[PDB]
Design a protein around this nucleic acid. Sequence first.
RNA 1: UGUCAGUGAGAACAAGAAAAACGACUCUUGUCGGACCUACUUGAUCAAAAGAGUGGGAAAACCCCGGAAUCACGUAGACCCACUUGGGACCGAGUAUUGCAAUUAUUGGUCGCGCAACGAGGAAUGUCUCGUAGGCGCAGCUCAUCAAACUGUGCCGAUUACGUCC
RNA 2: UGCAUGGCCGCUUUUGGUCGGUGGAGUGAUUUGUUUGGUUGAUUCCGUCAACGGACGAGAUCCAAGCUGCCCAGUAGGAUUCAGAAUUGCCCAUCCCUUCCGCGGGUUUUACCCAAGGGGGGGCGGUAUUCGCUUGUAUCCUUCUCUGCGGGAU
Lengths: 140, 140, 310, 38, 190, 200, 99
Amino acid sequence: KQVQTFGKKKTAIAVATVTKAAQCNIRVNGVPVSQILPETLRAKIMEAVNVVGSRHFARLRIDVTVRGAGQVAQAYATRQAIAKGLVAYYQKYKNEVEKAALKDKYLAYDKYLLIADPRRCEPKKWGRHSARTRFTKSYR
Amino acid sequence: IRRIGKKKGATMKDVHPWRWVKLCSQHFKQEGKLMVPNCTEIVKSSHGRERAPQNPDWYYIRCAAILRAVYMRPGVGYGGLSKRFSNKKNRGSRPEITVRASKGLLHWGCKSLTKLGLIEKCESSGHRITKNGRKLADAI
Amino acid sequence: YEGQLKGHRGWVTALACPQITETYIKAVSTSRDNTLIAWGSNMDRNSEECEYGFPERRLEGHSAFVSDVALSNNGDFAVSASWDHSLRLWNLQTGVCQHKFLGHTKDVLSVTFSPDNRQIVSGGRDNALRVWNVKGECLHTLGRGAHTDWVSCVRFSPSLETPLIVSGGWDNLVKVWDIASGRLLTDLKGHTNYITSVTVSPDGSLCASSDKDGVARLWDLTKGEALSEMAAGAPINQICFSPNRYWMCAATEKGIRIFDLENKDVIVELAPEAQQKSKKTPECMSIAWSADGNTLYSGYTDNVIRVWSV
Amino acid sequence: RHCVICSNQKAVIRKYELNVCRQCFRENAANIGFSKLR
Amino acid sequence: MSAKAPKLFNKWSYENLQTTEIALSDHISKTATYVPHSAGRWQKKRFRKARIPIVERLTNGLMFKGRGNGKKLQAVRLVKHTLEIIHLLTDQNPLQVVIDAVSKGAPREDSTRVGSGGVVRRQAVDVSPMRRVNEAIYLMCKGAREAAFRNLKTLPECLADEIVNASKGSSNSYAIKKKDEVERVAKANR
Amino acid sequence: KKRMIIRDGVFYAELFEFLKRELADDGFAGVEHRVTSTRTEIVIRATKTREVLGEKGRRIRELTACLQQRFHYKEGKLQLFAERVEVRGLSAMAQAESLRFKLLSNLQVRRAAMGIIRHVMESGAKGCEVTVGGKIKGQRAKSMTFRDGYMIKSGTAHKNFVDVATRHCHLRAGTLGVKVKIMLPKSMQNEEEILPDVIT
Amino acid sequence: QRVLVKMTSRNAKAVENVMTELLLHARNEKVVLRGPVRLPTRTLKVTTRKTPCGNGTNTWDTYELKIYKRLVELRAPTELVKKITSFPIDAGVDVAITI
RNA sequence: UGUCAGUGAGAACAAGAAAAACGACUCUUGUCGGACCUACUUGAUCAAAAGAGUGGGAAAACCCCGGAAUCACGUAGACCCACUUGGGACCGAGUAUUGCAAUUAUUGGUCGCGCAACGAGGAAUGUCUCGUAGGCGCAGCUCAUCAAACUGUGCCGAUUACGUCC
RNA sequence: UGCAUGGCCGCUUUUGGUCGGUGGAGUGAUUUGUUUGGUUGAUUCCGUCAACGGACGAGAUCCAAGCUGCCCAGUAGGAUUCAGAAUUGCCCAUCCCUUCCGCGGGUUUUACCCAAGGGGGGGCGGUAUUCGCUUGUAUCCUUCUCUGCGGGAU
């Protein structure tokens, strides 16, 4: 039993491959979760899984391939694709009731879940550097 | 592949083969140790371990990334130009090790310039990292 | 009332319950938030602060709102007319897509199943009345050029003695078609506005067609002639027939009413609430008779489905 | 360098993507298929 | 289970906490997240900045003055240490000490220029709730940078010192002296 | 490729400039070219196609020959045709040339411009404009406007509809400028940005 | 091997007349037609100072081209490819290839 | 300088865009490869700068089309409240590279001088309310050769205000 | 020589401004339209009036970004098995647990905790990794990609 979802935030896309387990501790890339070098980002990725059952619903084997932005945005993207995968699994193989329980509690707890946070970038324009602070003034 | 990032590759895959390799000699120690290892130093090459934080790691990179060498392998090299001429700092590398590190793999845990394992000795001997530290590890 | 289903995040446009399906007790209803919900009656003790049932699955993901949904006769599938290009037979076992039927460049208005699991019939704003099989090959597409306007609703005749399909219009017609030759059978006319819905009673000899005027023309399909009209006195949002009776009980923008050929007027009039248009502005967008045919579930403008008994 | 649609060699030579149209400015000397829309 | 309903920093508990003031209770909110690290949109509307705890707000306004400064993740590294320090010093949950310090270092009355005639005039002007919060935060964490600027040997510890002395009302803290001196003009002139 | 498109731009530029100078007051609209596989049609848009050809046939083969000798083309890979543009009014550049001729003949600015305006606006054009800046006095650099019907400069869509021409006249005392616009009654995007219609 | 057709052009609505319309002739008629979705579309962006002198506000422009590369694939025509590439004549910079 | 913090090491990880073709050779009944990059290996039985051979590309092919800075790190690194081990600017010696021609042109290099300035800097004054400001790096651009400049893409990413018209 | 001049660019001006016909008023220069009020970035609207009916700018049409349908695969990238390398972690922790249930102990009671068995679920091996080349050997697909054309609210 499988589903495959994606995270998207900034220019990082994550790809969450779900393959049926009823145990497996969740991991990322080539480095699992206890060996993720930035402790802070590790903690972010934890709150995804930890909340809404620590290993009570989080029992699927979920590994990811995340590329396309710096370390921080990849960790964000990770959380998203994980929780997406759980939800979609509990949609197909299991009733809407269980999904509604899980989902509602995700939505509540400040990520939102649903949002890609799709605020990207600015263009550089004119005759001007970034958004305005110009060169610096001539007298007026 | 197998090596690096399965034991925490940053600091708990390094010290253990380091001890073992210095206790019974294996890798190159060729003169050139004193010479600049990383761009625009104002100091000597390092305080201690001039070319003994290097060799297994320089195998590791090429191992898991498959035949990154001499120009790609300095990809996971370093250089910031951390002192500079009052212009914007730029990345570099020093070629000195490239020669020596493509020599290396023909002995000890790798085979050739096409095949980079044997029994993958480093992995197997690193299975005792997790078990017990040799540095008084925090996490063990 | 007798339990309610309160789980929607958008308008119930069309409610569909077993009347050509005898498999399970499951209902299927169209949310207008780009999802489709597949319910079932599961737990009811017929109390207001308890539910009539639970959602079975939710069939999700579209570019646009769902129109109507029909239960497969014994297939356990849910076919959807959708205001996007996709027309999907779905599955209610796994909750996910079976096959995508794409023949449409302007989007599907109505789907329903033949009383035997066989034909799918896809209306559209193409102005094309298409006979698909259930496989996902388009078998034929009817026309004599009769359609000049949108196919408002389509209902198979429950008699297959002559294969028939009863289509509405926004050309102010009700066109019955012989399916086999793609031939236009006798037009039934005099509607002064566009058809809202067209239903046929279980005998296949009587067809209640509606219009936006607020009158229902009763039609002999047998003779191509007209019977006595039922006049709602308010615009009709849905028109239906009971499985176990000939009771129409049409939905209107004032509520649901109890209409039948015996009186052709109210027995009781069931208002959805008191002070309707000084509160939430409810209208009954759809009515789905139960398999029993003694309960009538009403869809709403509001995000609820309510139970109503006779 | 040097230019082939003037002989000035000054008032700046474009050699980007193998063309000169800045010893005769491209605003005046268009129909190279370029447009500005953004 | 055991991280579903339970909420920690990683050992610091939010059950203990109580809002110290009753003037402030809709601009001081409790944390549930395991790091104060931000990733959301934090402003779009006049009050949308008071939906979130003092912790997050503080850690973001902790330092500026870029040159290659590591911003948020770096700040969080100092947060951890400073919480442990405050814990063993007050012998009490560090979080609840922060709750106190933000309230008790804040100026609660002000006086402003608003006069005319070629001259200024001052009147007693009450500080609004969100302002008490914000102003307190900024002053405390301004103190920090100045303390380590060429001085002390301490890296996180100055933060812990300040937060302690602020909660005690002691005039060691950079925040406390401001509340004091401002109110000596704003309750001595109306 | 990258280079293809650029070089096509170059070819069009050179071609267009050569003709628009040295063949003029024939109602020259421009040129258009397309390939037919190892041959290039290169049609020449003129109101009067007779001068393009020549009545001795010298003109058309001269213009083929100039192109060949520059670009190393040969016969059967290169060809030149004429095309009859009806209604000189709807071609900016063509009207521009006739106007230029009036002015070089030393006829009145007013009278001249009025000719153009009459011609254009008869064929059913939405509007036209003739902005003639330059000498007419001395001592000014006076600018005279003549504006007719209606014309839009809004959006970027306007640029497609409205074709424009700028030309010079060279007279005693020095240069006189000339410009012609002309908003076509027929769209080249098949698009309008105004008037919602109701089909009854 | 398998023959492919790449059509490179400045403009859309030249290439469109090639791929959609004139591949119908090769669709199952003489060879089989595997349609993918066309390759990424490059921009050639150039930046040109508006002002011909040093007094303005030092303004610039952004000029862009589209490069449409329309790829559709076939399964080994030989000698039939002559028909395929003789079909478009409808615009300049329509170039076609044979492997 | 302690909010990369200064010299050391290792980990994970980014996006537009640039590129090629000489009447010069060879090839034939009508003609093909050299001025672009990057890969790989020798360049360490002994430096950097730098030499050369093989290999592919007209680019979604170029080796994973995309990587090393901001960042992460307690590996129990080193320095540690100093104008220093913080900063460079002057100054001398050597060498290689580029070019039609170098006269510090070269400069990605060695190694001197640093204990030369300067410790957030009077009056005055600049500009931005959100993925912005600020911080950081890369490419294009110009073109014998050099970017503290200009243009574009990406990364880390806030505080305050969301009011008035003085 | 830019104070002979063409074209182009800057700025006035980043605001909401501009002009004519017919009619009204004034000897005329001029004015009315383009006006008290409210609303809006807006001469943007509704209302009112000696104005009536119009034209531009604004709006809109365009370009790029965010979500999505259809197109959709050989240089875009995944899925399963075959495949062997490799690991099969017991040297400091992942054979031991969870859930449901029954009985006996340590408790005077409460809290707390110990032992045994039945049912149920797999966990470390029935889910084992990752290789972006082992470019090997088998099978399948379009979630991740891509571009054109359409959906989606003042």
